Design a protein around this ligand. Structure first.
Ligand SMILES: CC(C)n1nc(C(F)F)cc1C(=O)Nc1ccc([C@H]2[C@@H](O)CCCc3cncn32)c(-c2ccccc2)c1
Ligand SMILES: [Zn+2]
Lengths: 135, 141, 43, 273, 196, 76, 213, 298
């Protein structure tokens, strides 16, 4: 997420010519940064209200809702907007596939720990592996 | 009549149908079928009114169908019991709520009922086989 | 009343399956007696 | 730094290529091939891999770009959604010949990968290594070198079944299923027991005290139980009850069949025609 | 009267005849041509004829062209502003007045369909604000669209909103289980009734 | 002139043809030599399926070439 | 690894130099586990003297929490914003180690944040440091953690490690025994059924043979 | 050595081809050996085809009484079970691919063709039988391979069958084992009609020394996917289709019972048993996973 202060610093560093702004407003760089902020917040929230999204993007809640709806319609990002509660919902992450992913992560952790153990005490781990079959 | 039925002007359509009924009753080949045709048309209108709604207000429905709320409630009960309307009435706030049935619970219930019936029938026919093998029957004396 | 996501419902279905299994086992046991019947060898 | 997912089909292709070339030429010789896959954001995945035609002049290796382009058209005819990713070779650590061939390949794509397989190895881990090109300035001179990447084996049901069948190559049914699960659980047990031993040996005092390994062991121990939430429990019980109902219906069908056979035999026996 | 498709085909054939033969009448025929173009909304090439552009760029007659551009763009505000602002050209002709209603309704329907896509439960006053019509008009349009199976959703009258069905469950499994149960019931009854 | 003809399986047929012969003529020559009817037959040259009628020399006889032959099943 | 460099450059320093180095390493971004620095004999010997406050601060940063710092604010030396942020990140990690679905209320109480925006910004920073991987749920007021790093350990903690690993090994062994027993039972049942069917068929054949003669 | 089979003998192959002994006999080819890479490529292509059908070509050789397969390459056809071969696109593709592979080191020649029958068994239909008959009539040898990428996932074992047909007018003398295969109702007539015109070879798989070493090294990291499989979710549409087919077969069996090939109730029972056993296996795998991971409360 690119913050407003960093955006302002970049704008100050930028040359005047490169600041291509549309006549109605919404300068190209600012629009790209807002869309990037929304797409990056899609990777961080299960669901976010309009007020908090507006606080995150430093834009009014109505503009946040309009931009999110446009992005969802155009297919750039996945989700759906519940207007009565004013909440944008991103991906679901179903429970059983989440269980599968976490089991895979646990087994990967076990494998990495075993590799680190065998890379630090090679003689000890060789002796332990040799005695593993016997015992 | 047909255009207003198509574009959901039910009050006007029904009013003009009732106006035309008196002249229609004096026909030759349509006099016996007037009552059945009018009942079918009114039921079709009632079913089509509730089609787009998930929670309808019964006051507006009663106003649009030229009937009181009590008469509309009775007609809705008759329709929900058998016909195409799948809904539940709420007579506190006078609101008709669409009812969505979950498939999982219904299939579980029906499958368990079928299993119970199957087991009962199997036991009964096992007893029938036993009595048939043993040759038990009622004689004249 | 209920949704079918409980160990109690699992146990109920298990009991029903056990009863059906016993029924089928008895059916097969009384079928084999007819099968090995000498009278049920001519026809 | 991009996450790389490998596929055992690529490794099998490379190994078969090397074995075939060795058997054909009588003596071992290194082979050069190309990879194919999909890139999604920063996630690179390899799926298949074909072979490239190369020539040697003096001491330098040159890849036939015409043959590469014909093969590219051929593979785009079949795998429409797949694209070029990099090249693969058999050998040891990277060499200046490898750097030269990578420079040649870099004229085709922006940042091609580089896969290296070692047929003659003595280690315990897989000899497959993945590198990417990084250009640096050393002592005021521009040189492009290699940076190693960490890869994970990708998951696929058909691939898993095929690989397990090929690896195993071997009177019930529950038997087989449970035997497979047993093999995997056995591997897990071995690994967890060796870790517990190290930890117990470190605690009592037999090996030098290592802090990173002990912290990672604590983190591993803090990961259990996995997904003890109410939504997961509800989903699990949903699945269990669904399978239970299917088993109930299957039992009913089998009982109906047995009933029909018994009724037929009873009718044949106890009826006078 | 304008009896739907038959009258439409009669109109195209008559307009083609008056284009081939009535060359000097194009000054008033172009309005009817573009109107027919927006009624069919299939050709969407009224500007294909390069000869018509020099005569169209004259500012006396441009309401038809800006209407076509607004209609293709599918925006209601520009259409309404041009319609009410332009005077003595559009609203005085009965042959345009009788067909402006469907013309204005088509863009509203398309804009509503495009708007409804991302939301799951959306207020009716919001739609009324977007489409520049009263709440009752929005409700009537939603009812007509839902009955026509162009909008997949249902209206909540008490809370004045509409909820669109976006969730899909696996009902095929339960339908298959129902079929299996019914077949098992019938088969069991027949097998039992065999013995007698 | 004479041009070994090779199929996908690996069989090669030593066949005698004239430079002035057309593709249909080569097809019936193969029919007489092996037995394949001249409709379940596709000859491909240099990765190219010949449009029958188009004579042959044009294409490029160049003596001992190897026209690739693949079978077909007409309709059934 | 900044900790390795700090350990390497801490050999000759002592006293004021040691305390300045401790403050620098605590404020240094990236380093989140301080076990070897605490293991240093010099640092452990810093206890005797008037600078035990810095040793207590290092112990708090190794195994400690923001409520602990608040309870012991007076004794410990003052900390800057970077150190407070690091302590808050370590508090989040400590909570996620024992709880995998952390409510917002406990996080707010522990970190003494006022509005939800500050807490969510802090959690986003912690996620971006690659020390905790998870997602934020606003509707249910939850933070779901998929992964969290292992913090520093004591000498007496390893008993819990060995106990948990022993329990896991016992569970795996029990599962293997159950699988073996189930396979044996299934095979025995199949062979028994086949034998019974063969015996019945043989009896039927014998009866037919003796009847047909 | 084990890699000896990987050595291609051009002279021996030419001698065997020119001294064809399969003409005197009819059931000459009885063993079919497949390399590991060829089998894996076939399975992955059939799986990636999805629900539709895919077909490719197979390159190998012959050693006396057995038929060896070393490689397999797909050909496009746009798939989608087109009417038959190709708008000549595949016709050019086969020759182009073989020529391109010739100049690299793939010096073996074609030996058969493979295709997928996703969800309805492994057999040769009428058009498949005609195709194999035509191919064997002119270019010999040739073997058909049929894969079932869906039943492979469902049952946990590969469903691969290698077949070879009989000459026109030849009546094979009995010797029909005819093991039971579940086949849907809409595809049962073709299987019944065209069943004695082909026979199934005995299929075995082989691999090289480096392949064996690499697989035994790879298992040490691949053991995770076995414990994180969850086969009950990836195959649900297949189970629904199986239940639908079984219900239709049960209806037909009840109709036969009411009326006055043989005992369709037994076939329906076997189908139901297969489906239910697969489902229970999928459930007990998850039960084992839960016991292993969710109960070891720290
Ligand atoms: C070896 C190949 C190239 N071949 N050679 C000759 C012969 F003329 F030489 C002829 C052929 C050849 O493509 N046959 C063929 C025939 C039928 C089908 C389809 C067809 O029925 C359509 C329904 C699906 C199906 C189920 N079972 C066979 N099919 C296919 C085929 C199979 C999978 C993907 C694409 C096509 C290929
Ligand atoms: Zn087929």
């Amino acid at each position: 997420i690119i913050r407003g202060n960093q955006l302002q610093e970049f704008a100050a560093m930028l040359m005047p010519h490169q600041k291509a702004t549309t006549a109605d407003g919404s300068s190209i760089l600012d629009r790209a940064v807002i869309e990037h902020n929304l797409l990056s917040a899609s990777k961080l929230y299960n669901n976010i209200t309009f007020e908090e999204l507006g606080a995150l993007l430093e834009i009014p809640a109505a503009k946040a809702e309009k931009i999110a709806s446009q992005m969802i319609t155009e297919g750039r990002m996945n989700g759906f907007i519940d207007q009565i509660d004013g909440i944008v919902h991103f991906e679901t992450r179903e429970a059983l596939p989440t269980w599968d992913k976490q089991i895979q992560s646990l087994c990967f952790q076990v494998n990495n720990l075993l590799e680190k153990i065998s890379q630090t005490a090679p003689e000890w781990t060789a002796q332990a592996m040799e005695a593993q079959m016997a015992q | 009549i047909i255009f207003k039925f198509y574009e959901s002007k039910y009050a006007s359509c029904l009013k003009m149908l009732d106006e035309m009924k008196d002249n229609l009753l004096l026909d030759m080949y349509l006099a016996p079928h007037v009552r059945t045709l009018y009942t079918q048309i009114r039921n079709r209108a009632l079913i089509q009114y509730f089609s787009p709604y998930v929670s309808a207000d019964m006051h507006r429905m009663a106003a649009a169908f030229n009937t009181t709320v009590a008469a509309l409630e009775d007609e809705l009960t008759q329709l929900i019991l058998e016909g195409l309307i799948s809904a539940r009435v709420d007579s506190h706030s006078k609101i008709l709520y669409a009812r969505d049935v979950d498939q999982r619970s219904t299939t579980f219930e029906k499958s368990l009922l079928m299993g119970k019936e199957f087991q009962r029938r199997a036991k009964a026919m096992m007893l029938r086989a036993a009595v048939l093998r043993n040759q038990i029957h009622v004689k004249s004396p | 009343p209920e949704k079918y996501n409980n160990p109690a419902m699992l146990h109920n279905i298990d009991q029903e399956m056990l009863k059906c299994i016993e029924l089928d086992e008895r059916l097969k046991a009384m079928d084999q007696e007819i099968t090995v019947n000498p009278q049920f060898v001519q026809k | 730094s991009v996450s790389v997912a490998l596929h055992p089909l690529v490794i099998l292709n490379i190994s078969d290529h090397w074995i075939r070339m060795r058997s054909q030429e009588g003596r071992p010789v290194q082979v050069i091939g190309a990879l194919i896959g999909k890139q999604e954001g920063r996630n690179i995945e390899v799926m298949n891999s074909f072979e490239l035609l190369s020539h040697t002049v003096e001491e330098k290796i040159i890849i036939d770009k015409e043959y590469y382009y014909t093969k590219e058209e051929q593979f785009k005819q079949v795998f429409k959604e797949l694209e070029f990713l990099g090249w693969y070779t058999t050998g040891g650590p990277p060499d200046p010949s490898d750097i030269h061939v990578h420079k040649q390949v870099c004229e085709i794509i922006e940042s091609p990968l580089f896969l290296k397989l070692n047929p003659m190895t003595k280690h315990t881990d897989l000899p497959v290594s993945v590198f990417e090109s990084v250009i640096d300035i050393i002592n005021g001179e521009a040189t492009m070198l290699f940076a190693e990447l960490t890869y994970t084996l990708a998951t696929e049901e058909a691939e898993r079944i095929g690989v397990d069948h090929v690896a195993r190559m071997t009177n019930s049914t529950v038997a087989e299923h449970l035997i497979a699960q047993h093999s995997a659980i056995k591997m897990l047990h071995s690994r967890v027991k060796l870790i517990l031993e190290y930890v117990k040996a470190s605690e009592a005092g037999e090996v030098p005290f290592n802090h990173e390994i002990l912290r990672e062991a604590y983190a591993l121990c803090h990961c259990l139980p996995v997904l003890s939430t109410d939504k997961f429990k509800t989903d699990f019980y949903d699945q269990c009850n669904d399978v239970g109902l299917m088993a109930y219906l299957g039992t009913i069908t089998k009982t109906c069949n047995t009933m029909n056979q018994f009724v037929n035999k009873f009718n044949v026996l106890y009826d006078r025609q | 009267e304008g009896e739907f498709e038959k009258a439409h085909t009669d109109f195209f054939e008559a307009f083609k005849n008056y284009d081939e033969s009535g060359s000097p009448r194009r000054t008033t025929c172009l309005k009817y041509l573009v109107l027919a173009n927006m009624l069919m909304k299939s050709g969407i090439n009224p500007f294909d004829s390069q000869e018509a552009k020099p005569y169209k760029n004259d500012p006396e007659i441009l309401a038809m062209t800006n209407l076509v551009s607004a209609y293709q763009n599918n925006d209601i505000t520009e259409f309404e502003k041009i319609l009410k602002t332009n005077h003595s050209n559009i609203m005085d002709d009965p042959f345009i007045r009788e067909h402006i209603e469907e013309l204005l309704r088509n863009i509203r329907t398309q804009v509503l369909i495009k708007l409804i896509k991302p939301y799951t439960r959306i207020h009716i006053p919001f739609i009324s604000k977007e489409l520049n019509i009263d709440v009752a008009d929005v409700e009537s349009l939603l009812v007509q669209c839902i009955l026509d199976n162009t909008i997949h959703g249902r209206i909540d009258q008490v809370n004045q909103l509409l909820e669109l069905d976006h969730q899909k469950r696996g009902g095929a499994r339960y339908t298959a289980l129902d079929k299996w149960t019914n077949q098992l019931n019938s088969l069991n009854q027949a097998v039992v009734s065999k013995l007698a | 002139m004479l041009i070994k003809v090779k199929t996908l399986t690996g069989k090669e047929i030593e066949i005698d043809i004239e430079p002035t012969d057309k593709v249909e003529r080569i097809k019936e020559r193969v029919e007489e030599k092996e037995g394949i009817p001249p409709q379940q037959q596709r000859l491909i040259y240099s990765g190219k399926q010949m449009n029958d009628e188009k004579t042959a020399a044009d294409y490029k006889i160049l003596g001992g070439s190897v026209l690739h032959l693949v079978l077909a099943l007409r309709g059934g | 690894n900044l900790l390795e460099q700090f350990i390497l450059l801490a050999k000759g320093t002592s006293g004021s130099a040691l305390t300045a180095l401790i403050s620098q390493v605590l404020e240094a971004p990236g380093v989140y586990v301080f076990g070897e620095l605490l293991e240093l004999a010099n640092v452990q010997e810093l206890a005797e003297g008037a600078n035990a406050a810095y040793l207590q601060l290092l112990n708090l940063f190794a195994y400690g929490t923001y409520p602990d710092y608040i309870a012991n604010k007076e004794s410990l030396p003052e900390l800057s914003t970077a150190q407070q942020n690091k302590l808050k990140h370590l508090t989040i990690v400590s909570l996620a180690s024992r709880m995998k679905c952390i409510p917002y209320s406990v996080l707010l109480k522990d970190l003494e944040m006022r509005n939800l925006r500050e807490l969510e910004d802090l959690i986003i920073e912690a996620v971006y440091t690659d020390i905790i991987q998870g997602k934020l749920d606003q509707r249910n007021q939850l933070l779901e953690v998929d992964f969290c790093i292992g913090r520093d350990i004591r000498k007496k903690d390893i008993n819990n490690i060995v106990k948990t690993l022993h329990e896991w090994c016992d569970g795996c062994e029990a599962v293997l025994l159950g699988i073996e027993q189930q396979v044996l039972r299934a095979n025995q049942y199949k062979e028994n059924h086949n034998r019974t069917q063969q015996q019945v068929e043989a009896e039927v054949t014998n009866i037919k043979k003796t009847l047909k003669a | 050595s084990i890699d000896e089979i990987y050595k291609y003998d051009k002279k021996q192959q030419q001698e065997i081809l020119a001294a064809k002994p399969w003409t005197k006999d009819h059931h000459y080819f009885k063993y079919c050996k497949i390399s590991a890479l060829a089998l894996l490529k076939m399975v992955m292509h059939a799986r990636s085809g999805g629900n539709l059908e895919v077909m490719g070509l197979m390159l190998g050789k012959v050693d006396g009484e057995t038929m060896i397969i070393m490689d397999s390459f797909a050909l496009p056809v746009e798939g989608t079970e087109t009417r038959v071969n190709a708008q000549a696109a595949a016709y050019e593709y086969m020759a182009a691919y073989i020529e391109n592979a010739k100049q690299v080191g793939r010096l073996e020649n074609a030996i058969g063709w493979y295709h997928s029958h996703p969800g309805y068994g492994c057999w040769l239909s009428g058009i498949d039988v005609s195709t194999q008959m035509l191919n064997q009539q002119f270019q010999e040898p040739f073997v058909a391979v049929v894969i079932d990428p869906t039943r492979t996932i469902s049952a946990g074992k590969v469903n691969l069958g290698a077949f070879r047909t009989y000459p026109k007018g030849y009546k094979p003398p009995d010797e029909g084992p005819s093991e039971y295969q579940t086949i849907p109702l809409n595809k049962i007539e073709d299987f019944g009609v065209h069943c004695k015109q082909y026979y199934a070879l005995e299929v075995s798989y082989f691999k090289s020394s480096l392949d064996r070493k690499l697989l035994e090294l790879l298992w040490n990291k691949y053991w995770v996917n076995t414990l994180s499989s969850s086969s009950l979710l990836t195959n649900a549409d297949y189970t629904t289709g199986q239940v639908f087919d079984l219900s239709e077969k049960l209806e037909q069996s009840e109709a036969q019972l009411g009326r006055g090939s043989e005992d369709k109730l037994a076939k329906a029972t076997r189908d139901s048993c297969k489906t239910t056993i697969e489902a229970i296996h999928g459930l007990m795998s998850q039960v084992i996973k839960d016991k292993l991971f969710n109960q070891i409360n720290i």
